[PDB]
Amino acid sequence: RKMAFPSGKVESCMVQVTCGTTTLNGLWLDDVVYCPRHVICTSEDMLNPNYEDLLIRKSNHNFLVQAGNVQLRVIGHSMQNCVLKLKVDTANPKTPKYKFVRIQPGQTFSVLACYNGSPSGVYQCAMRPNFTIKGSFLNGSCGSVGFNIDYDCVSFCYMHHMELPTGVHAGTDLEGNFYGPFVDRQTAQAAGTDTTITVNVLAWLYAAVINGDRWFLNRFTTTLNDFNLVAMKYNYEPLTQDHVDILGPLSAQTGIAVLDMCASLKELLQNGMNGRTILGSALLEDEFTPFDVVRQC
Amino acid sequence: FRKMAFPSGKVESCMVQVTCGTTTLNGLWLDDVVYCPRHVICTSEDMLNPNYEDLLIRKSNHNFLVQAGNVQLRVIGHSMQNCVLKLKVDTANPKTPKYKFVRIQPGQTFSVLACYNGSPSGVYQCAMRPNFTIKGSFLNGSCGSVGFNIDYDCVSFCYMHHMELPTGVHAGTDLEGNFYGPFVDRQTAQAAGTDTTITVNVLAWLYAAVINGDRWFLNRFTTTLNDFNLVAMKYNYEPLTQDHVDILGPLSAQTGIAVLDMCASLKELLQNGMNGRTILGSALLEDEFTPFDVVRQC
Ligand SMILES: COc1cccc2[nH]c(C(=O)N[C@@H](CC(C)C)C(=O)N[C@@H](C[C@@H]3CCNC3=O)C(=O)COP(=O)(O)O)cc12
Ligand SMILES: COc1cccc2[nH]c(C(=O)N[C@@H](CC(C)C)C(=O)N[C@@H](C[C@@H]3CCNC3=O)C(=O)COP(=O)(O)O)cc12
Structure with missing residues (x-):
């Protein structure tokens, strides 16, 4: 979840x-x-x-x-x-070990939503390919941050600035650089058209397999370039070399080649689900990274 | 949302x-x-x-x-x-918050802080199901993880984790050690009673979806409370009380949609399916947001 x-x-x-x-x-x-x-x-x-x-x-x-x-x-x-x-004039005595990092689209992080410096809620977000996030923010929420925790080191990756007319949200990294083509002005800005996070759909198929749901596994394979041309035709992100590499652990664990899995997702794209679920859903889930799959599992 | x-x-x-x-x-x-x-x-x-x-x-x-x-x-x-x-x-926790021990009633939500070897690992929202299970996310070594609500600096602990049922839902106790449901801390395969859907929460969630612009399920019809409950019971939804109607007031006042109107909307969703559409991005009627969760978020 x-x-x-x-x-x-x-x-x-x-x-x-x-x-x-x-x-x-x-x-x-x-x-x-x-x-x-x-x-x-x-x-x-x-x-x-x-x-x-x-x-x-x-x-x-x-x-x-x-x-x-x-x-x-x-x-x-x-x-x-x-x-x-x-x-x-005071060094925060509760300063954790930390770094400022710029995340890539598809990566997840937690948001600590705050109002008047007072934490209100925490939730998991994914940076969409159009550099928006689908968050939950009222007025007073600017400055709220997003973050990951690796070995009690906090990687701060997002500071909240904006809600777009479409209700999605935009902000910067901790160096003040916006993700996406947004500016900090009182202006109706438009997001690029979003796409599906392919590396995350694949991770989620691995988690299905890890759990025994494997009907979708096919006998075919594909090149990465052929899959990326077919993927863009369904509004799916093309796969980078970094994407294949972070699919590596889930590949080794299930025994399923990253590119056989790619050929299996392609079928799901050309022929759909056939009234069949995957991990309980009728829809392919794209906001779990391979880290999130391994994180638990 | x-x-x-x-x-x-x-x-x-x-x-x-x-x-x-x-x-x-x-x-x-x-x-x-x-x-x-x-x-x-x-x-x-x-x-x-x-x-x-x-x-x-x-x-x-x-x-x-x-x-x-x-x-x-x-x-x-x-x-x-x-x-x-x-x-x-021999040592008092110096970071002990204002706290209370509460027994949660079914349908209510809380935050679970998943821990392992005494180290926090994740946090997420759960509901006490009607059959006194929770659809948690728990692994080996999670026993002792707690559920809680915070209300202005006061923590209300309501759950301690003990058990994962064969169906993969979970069971535990309040902080006085009394199980939610007919479960025991034995190493045996235990089934829960048949679960039902938390109606007042689905309605809060429908109200949430209107506040976020999703309106395709609204309609012009209306229903009596009793004629809605007959259909709700047929579909394994909990009955709706007048009290539930009252708790939903704020959302209904906010959106201009009387509660008995949203029930006619839900009745039609139950009798016609969603025809492959989505509400707040879900293909399913979500029942783990209470009216307070919606109010506090929106
Ligand atoms: C013509 O104008 C528009 C048209 C169409 C869409 C638009 N969108 C924005 C916008 O988003 N503007 C930023 C400030 C910019 C100008 C730097 C803003 O309002 N940010 C909020 C968070 C927001 C508010 C509710 N949920 C959020 O995410 C804070 O973080 C605290 O701002 P407050 O000082 O507390 O009100 C302006 C605008
Ligand atoms: C024949 O037996 C069975 C058959 C069919 C289904 C069954 N289910 C259980 C069960 O759930 N048993 C509790 C302990 C009993 C004594 C109350 C437990 O097994 N484990 C967790 C929480 C669990 C671990 C996996 N997911 C969780 O939520 C702890 O954390 C404490 O124990 P451990 O630290 O793991 O040893 C036994 C059983």
Whole structure:
């Protein structure tokens, strides 16, 4: 099932940042607070703000950073693409081991949704191929982060900025770079047309096999280039070499070649399910990575 | 609209590892007591059918090996409340939250924090099914994992994991050791009563889908409460009470759709199938969101 990482290490890092009357969420790691730069906007700013000129008018004493109602004093500020970095005078004693990472489409992560620096909920998300995520966010949620946990090291990968007219969501990595062609303006932006995450559909077929559901296994094989040409015709992502490599463990475990599996999914694409389920669903599931399959299992 | 768990940090600070001999599971460390399932004291040979009390009198405090991360806690006492072992230790959990022990009623949801060897591993949302099972995600060594709700800094523990049924649904107890359902902490194959679908939750979920723009299942018809329950019972859905009607008010006030209107919508879904369409991306009528879960998310 959809399963989030335990959130306690990220929870102890959430703070709020206020400019005038705009309060977003921030991420407090060591003695730096990271938040979306549009906190320095007010209403007339937003259509096309001048973050350069807006941040010139700013001084350290304009920034109210609070862990709860305890203020942390700002001693430096700077902009790095779309994230503001506020240097504070206290190193967060609950700073976990961590890295900032830029994820690829198809990869999953947990979102800690927060409001006023207060965690509200946790859930698993997948970065769609059009660099949106299908999240759950109200107003006040900007600055909420997404993350993975590997050996109690936290890999921060997403900071939330935007809800698109289609209800899906957009944001940056922790260096302030948007995933996708989105800009942090009060603007109706359009997502690229999404596609199905092929490497994840394959992982899910392996998990079916691991569990005894293998009727779909065929006797054929394919080249990777022939599958990628047939896959794009069904709005499926083409497979990279990195995709085949992370399918490796599930391949070895089931004994099924990655490219026989590809030839098996192709059949499911040309001929459908035939009123037959796979792991209980009538639809192919594309938001479990091979890591998520191995994670449990 | 996603299935959302409560932040698990408050529970993470409480999970520990409990080992007796060659069996290990998770315990819950609040104040100066560690709570764990009682079959941790069982040998392999014992687990088929053991006398738990005589198994416990023959126990020494020093045979219990409680590890909280890297520190070993010392057991200065023990007792047994139903299927839950209470291990008094010489150290109080300094990170003990405001908490309470609650017995959940069927249809209600909670967050499960899946743990292994006392280490948290995942968190997700479950519902107490009508037949007092939960459709969990649990492996070897998950026994002692807990379910809980948080309500303004207060944690309400409602479930401790014990068992996976042959059908692959799961069973356990409240934090006073009383099983949900007719299950026992024996190593035997146990079946549950026939399960049903949580009606008021499906309706909350239909209301969720309208709030997210999905409207294709709405219709102009309406129904009486009793004529809806006749059809719901026919399809193995729980009955709808007036109380359930009232709990749904906020969603019905919010969307402009009277509850008895959404029931006519659900009745037609039950009698006509979904014709290959989808609601909030699901091919199935989802019944593990309560009205409170929808309200708090939307
Ligand atoms: C013409 O305008 C539009 C037209 C059509 C679609 C549009 N979409 C946005 C947008 O999304 N705008 C960002 C801010 C940008 C301008 C930097 C925003 O509203 N983000 C929210 C999260 C959002 C709100 C609810 N659910 C979320 O995901 C926060 O993170 C806290 O913002 P608040 O200060 O608390 O209101 C503007 C817009
Ligand atoms: C003939 O026997 C059977 C036949 C058919 C079905 C059966 N089902 C069970 C059962 O579920 N038994 C509990 C222990 C009893 C004594 C209450 C258990 O087996 N295991 C887990 C949780 C489980 C592990 C797999 N998924 C979970 O949810 C623990 O965590 C504690 O024990 P372990 O640490 O694994 O040794 C026995 C059985």
